Design an enzyme around this catalytic site. Sequence first.
Site, mmCIF file in Angstrom:
data_model
loop_
_atom_site.group_PDB
_atom_site.id
_atom_site.type_symbol
_atom_site.label_atom_id
_atom_site.label_comp_id
_atom_site.label_asym_id
_atom_site.label_seq_id
_atom_site.Cartn_x
_atom_site.Cartn_y
_atom_site.Cartn_z
ATOM 1 C CG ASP A 66 -2.699 -4.236 -0.602
ATOM 2 O OD1 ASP A 66 -3.856 -4.704 -0.665
ATOM 3 O OD2 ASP A 66 -2.238 -3.606 0.390
ATOM 4 C CG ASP A 98 -5.765 -5.705 5.958
ATOM 5 O OD1 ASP A 98 -4.618 -6.211 5.973
ATOM 6 O OD2 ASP A 98 -6.133 -4.834 5.132
#
Lengths: 149, 742, 743, 141
Positions: free
Chosen positions: C547, C477
């Site tokens: 997301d 990430d």
Amino acid sequence: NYSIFPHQDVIVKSAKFTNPSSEKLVLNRALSSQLDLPDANYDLIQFSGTWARERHLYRHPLRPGMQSISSLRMASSHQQNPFMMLARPQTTDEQGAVFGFNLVYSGNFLDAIEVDQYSTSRILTGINPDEFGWNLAPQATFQTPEAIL
Amino acid sequence: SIHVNEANLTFHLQTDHTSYIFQIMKNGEAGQIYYGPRIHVQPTYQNLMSQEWRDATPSLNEENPNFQPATIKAEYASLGKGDFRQPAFQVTQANGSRITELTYDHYQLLTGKQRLANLPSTFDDTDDDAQTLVVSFNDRITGLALDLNYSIFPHQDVIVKSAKFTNPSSEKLVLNRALSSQLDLPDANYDLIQFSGTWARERHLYRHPLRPGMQSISSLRMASSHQQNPFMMLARPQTTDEQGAVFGFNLVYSGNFLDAIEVDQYSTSRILTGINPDEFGWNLAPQATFQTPEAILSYTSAGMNQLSQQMASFYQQHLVNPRFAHEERPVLINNWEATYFDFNEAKLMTIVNQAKRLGIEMFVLDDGWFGHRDDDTTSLGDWFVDQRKFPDGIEHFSQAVHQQGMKFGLWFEPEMVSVDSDLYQQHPDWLIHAPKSTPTPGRHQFVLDMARPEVVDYLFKLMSQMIESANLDYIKWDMNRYATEMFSSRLTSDQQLELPHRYILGVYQLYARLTQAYPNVLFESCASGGGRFDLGMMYYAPQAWTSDDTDAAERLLIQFGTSYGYPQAMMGAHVSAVPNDQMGRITSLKTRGAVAFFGDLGYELDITKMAPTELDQVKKQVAFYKCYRQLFQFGKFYRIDSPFVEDGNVTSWQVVSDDQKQAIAARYQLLNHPNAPYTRFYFKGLRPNQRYQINDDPSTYYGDELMNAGYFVPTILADGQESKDFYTQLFVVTAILEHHHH
Amino acid sequence: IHVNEANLTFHLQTDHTSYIFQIMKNGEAGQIYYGPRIHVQPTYQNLMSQEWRDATPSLNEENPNFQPATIKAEYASLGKGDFRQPAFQVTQANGSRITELTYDHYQLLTGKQRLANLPSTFDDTDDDAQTLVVSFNDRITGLALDLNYSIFPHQDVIVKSAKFTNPSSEKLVLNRALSSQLDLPDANYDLIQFSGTWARERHLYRHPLRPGMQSISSLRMASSHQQNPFMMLARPQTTDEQGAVFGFNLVYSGNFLDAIEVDQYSTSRILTGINPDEFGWNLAPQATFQTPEAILSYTSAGMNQLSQQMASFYQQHLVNPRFAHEERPVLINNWEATYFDFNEAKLMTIVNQAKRLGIEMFVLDDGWFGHRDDDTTSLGDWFVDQRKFPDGIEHFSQAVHQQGMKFGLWFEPEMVSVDSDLYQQHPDWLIHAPKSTPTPGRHQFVLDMARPEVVDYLFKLMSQMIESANLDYIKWDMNRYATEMFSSRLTSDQQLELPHRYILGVYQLYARLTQAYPNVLFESCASGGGRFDLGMMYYAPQAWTSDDTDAAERLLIQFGTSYGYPQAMMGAHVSAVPNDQMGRITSLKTRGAVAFFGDLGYELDITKMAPTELDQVKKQVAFYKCYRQLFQFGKFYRIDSPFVEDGNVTSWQVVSDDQKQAIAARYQLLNHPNAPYTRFYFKGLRPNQRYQINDDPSTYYGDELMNAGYFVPTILADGQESKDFYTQLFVVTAILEHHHHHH
Amino acid sequence: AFFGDLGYELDITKMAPTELDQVKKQVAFYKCYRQLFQFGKFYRIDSPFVEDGNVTSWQVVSDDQKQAIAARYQLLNHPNAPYTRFYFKGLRPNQRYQINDDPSTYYGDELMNAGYFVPTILADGQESKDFYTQLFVVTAI
């Protein structure tokens, strides 16, 4: 007939037919209001839909020939409402030239805007000419519903 | 006026109709609150300054998560403190770092508005209620000092913006980017309206909705483009010439510019204008300063005509050379398209004597009068007489004209130098040229290094001597190529990116010093016909040669497009020979003239060659123009039918006098069609309750008649004689002043 | 690729396109034509005609009509008569920025080799690729420039780059080093871009070109959430079904520029590569600079076709070959299920339930390291947190594996929290400008990846974890944007080299991890899709798309992503409801059905689910597995677009190689009463093949289903559930049996 | 339903005490302002017939403009959203107003020209945030 209501800028129109003559006459078409305009740079705004989805707003520039809404169902319909507007291309809810038109009538109606060869507009509202014909006997009368302009 | 709330650091500029409001924030930077139609002064605007958390973007610090520069409308942002939009400026330190942390220090509220010291600029000489707000900052990192200047011109709804950078530190700082003004708006529902084109087809109107990301127009040509003008607009989608909200932006600068508009992740707008950040770098030494050009801002709810008109008034009182800004401009004749290089004092007096007979009021001697210039290929820089075509020099010719009752003007192209000339043998080091590069010619010439003061001095001498020698009334100042391979040997290696801007400053020095010394000489700016049609020039020279395209139909599009950003008082316009030299169109003399009335009329063809009937038409045109000259040149200008909307076959505009008692409208049609709809012309700008007469029509009309119902214009009919194309209909409107019981 | 050595006319031919350019009088390369394929010819005197235009420089006095302003270029500079934007610019020791390229020689290779240090394209599949290298020299500085062009004829892709060489003795600076320039003869195109932001990436925007600059870019040391590197130039009537369109992409993951300029003569320059802003590269003597690769493509067969071929090109010639074609496992991730509030025992309940559902892999997310109980501490401490994992991770993975499942975990390498052991060991590793006030991003800062000591430390820490815990998979990430950019490792002059170097650093790390442990599946991530680009797909075959895991929002995000990226690349998890990002509630059927068209995954606390819900999920997984090859790698057609019209209906289709299987899906966002009859129009089928659809007993010819359509039942009220966000799925099976046909 | 002739058409005997209470207050609120709801001068603002039609807004204003109610409706909520700015119509420019429970007082012209900042619609894990209503009761000082 022309009734002016100055404080709301409304004009009310109707036609009335009298047969003083001695022969039988038949009205095949009897509209409440015809409006003729110098040009055609207008949008026709209209209200269409059906059951459970009435009177959504559609907005389309005028084009040569016929554009109209109407009913044949003996009721102003779910499908097309009698109120219509001719607006300038840049007119909005907040600013700009626009004409309103309505019918004080609940049966078959016709709203029609015709742009002819010279780019002028004819606006017709009233009882639908289709499925209509009044037998006007000698001395009889026909009153059209009022048009709100 | 300008209202400051010291307790809150709220800054509210109010014009007669608008509000521009900004606030200093917890981090020390300026933050844009609102700019639109005027609203009440408040101590603070909490609701509008509301901040909410947004994910995946940096924060001020841990005590202020919700203070995020990505969602804060800025007044003059840096890059690197959390905002990833295009910055208004950027500074490099000695160590490589480009971070700046401006912090508010003090403000200053001055009455009026003074000129900048060395840049064309705006002023308040006329008690017009202007004020100037200076808001200062210091950089926490470098010690750098920044002044943001906002000047309110309340009666034209104009705000003028600029930045001054100051270096009170002891370390060298490089300005990588120094824009003039940044505006951040809360939404992005606007159309970008720009003015693009090229040589002989400048400033056509283009209109486009904004989209996410960058949309900019710019110039790298060391000049404000032929290609792109600095004037732009943000119009709401439904706004037109007659109605609606619209922002206008301009730039008082003639060099490389950027007009940029970024719509970001949140559908907000950033509008940046100023010197083009590309090919720009400025070394700011200790104790050094740098002043940016002034950006011009304006807003109106009343439509684009209203916008143009208030910016026009603003330029007329607050920018354009005061000595000419309100002075009627003369009807000149020019020999350029008439003869080109093939002439001498003999054939040039025939056109002068004939000019006088038509009523013309000034003769301009164009290209060819100097050195041995008979080609476009030689002699630039040799600014003294060509004794082949002027045996007794210029003093002689200029006198023959002065006695026929006419003003005299002549042509120069100062910034240029021809390889075959006396200048290139005396000072070959004055050519702009990169060291090992192969030079690239433009119109067989090269450009002088205007960043060199000596070069400016040599030029001030030649032109001073020449203006005195000939008693010049006028000077046409051309500029016929775009610089190439830019380099100056006078400048350090670190200074090369300073060249484009120092060059323009040098141009300004020259204009400044000439106009100081001869306040009475009228200048017309020119750059192959307005490849420098910009406010920078208008400060010095109150008119520009709009375009080299002299065709009536092409001029319709150019003048119509230009009128958006510039008053007709600024556009030279000449009746020229047919078929048009540039693209071959044939127009009626009536039309070519009618198109030229709405500017500064002038003639540019061989009048000796005209039949007695044509000669007389010119004569009538000049008298008519003179009759109504105050109205053509300074009348309030209205656009009506646009060539840039729909078929664009009809164009129409109108001028109206201060009191509205007089007006002239013109309707133009490119292609005539058969079996035509009736014509109806809608007049603008009149008084509803005033009766008028129109040309030789017997009837009287109230103004609301002429504006609301319109005026019926007869069809254009074939007569077997002439082409009905490119056709003109004039309308002279005049009040009937009289007591009446309305 | 065909060269005419006599005229130095280079002409590239793919199956259907022709890119043609020519070395010119002044030594520079002149673009001639890029469009549908046309015949090879020695010279194109016609297309190369030149006419005098006024008020613009010419080469010299012998050639008034040679004017760079009206000449289409292949890689132009500024200063020589062209005033459009340049592809590159070079500053000398003396400040001069003039450059005069002059052709010297060319070379023609076979296939295509990787680039040394950058993600890039290759032909290791004997696929008829060719690389053309066209070298020039500057008459002024001695700099050498290689222009690369690799043809990939079977996917209609041409790949471009540039490599700069300094053979002179003096220092040269690159201010601008774009990867590709394309000049076209007109500007009648719409620019199609993909703009958005976090939780709403890559919505499609479609605008007509206009005079001047229209570009999109990134200054954030990543291709952004905000703007993606992929764009299109469509003719005005081009659609997903028909018509001409160019496609441009970029194998790069840092600052980019996509720029289109319409000049005074209504021509178009398309520039793509590293963002010229915040960039500058010091090229010492004997030094070289390689640009990232630009992907170019054209078709006349519409945008579906454009995405399809580009996607076949990526799958064969860009993606990590270890995973390019391998079915990706169904995973479960505890992020939106627990967040930081978890411990080993709690996670075991998940792993156990997960298995009974048929899920194939468990992915431990944020919180396992240091003392991550918040999002403000321990970022940098890539070792086990004993409060939540007493016997280290090695144990927890052992459990996962004994269950026949795969194990993956989450790193965010490039990042450092101030509350962390790492910070106390190398504070000088935080990217920070000398005197400035550090600006936090999600309570963290970024490591100077430009330093090779940093990459070594990270490589060592991660491999120790892959070996220790036998990782099958890593979610990598990256959750903030750098701020106050400075590197103490670089000199004053090199500061404009940080962004690109930082990116090279990331590649360094991915390059070393993937070579040493090639069985590890890397899912790329950046707060969702903040780095969703070809640069990362080379190493990590799939990205966490957004997301935002809401069904309705994903429709938009996935639809847009597909223009540039095949579903194989898009992670998609079925999430909990009402969605935590924005509150929408959606059927489990729909959340499932939007996620099949990518790499299916689950991100909800399945320990908190009712029996009937569990069974629904178990069935989604069996269904997805049954058709995994189709869903993940099948040819992708967009049909109804949420970006056209009112956007109420989105639909698409995946089709097998042999066109004998297909799955279509129609999603309607808002239900409306008294509706028109629905007709769904399949695409991508064989006209004369007979098919059946779901449990409908009738048989249909491909052409019935494609030209007449399929009637679909209206969505009716039943008094039980909302009929918003509704999905209709269509499983298409070919009927195989002998049949006497009447075609 | 407030912007018209309020009525109820459901089995109110099947509701729970708090829903019942909500309708109680709905009805009291409407009667309190029935004169303005039913007969106020009606202004369309954000149209669902223009662009995405995701947002709809309208407003009713009294004859003296000292009192008014507006409503902004949003069909689908979207994440990470632009800030909302609502533009009021038909107020008096130089008249000071209050809005719902906001403590500040705004001039008519602020509210019409600059707009009024409305908070983002946030997920709360409890209800859907689709088909959301923002109601503004606008009263002169």
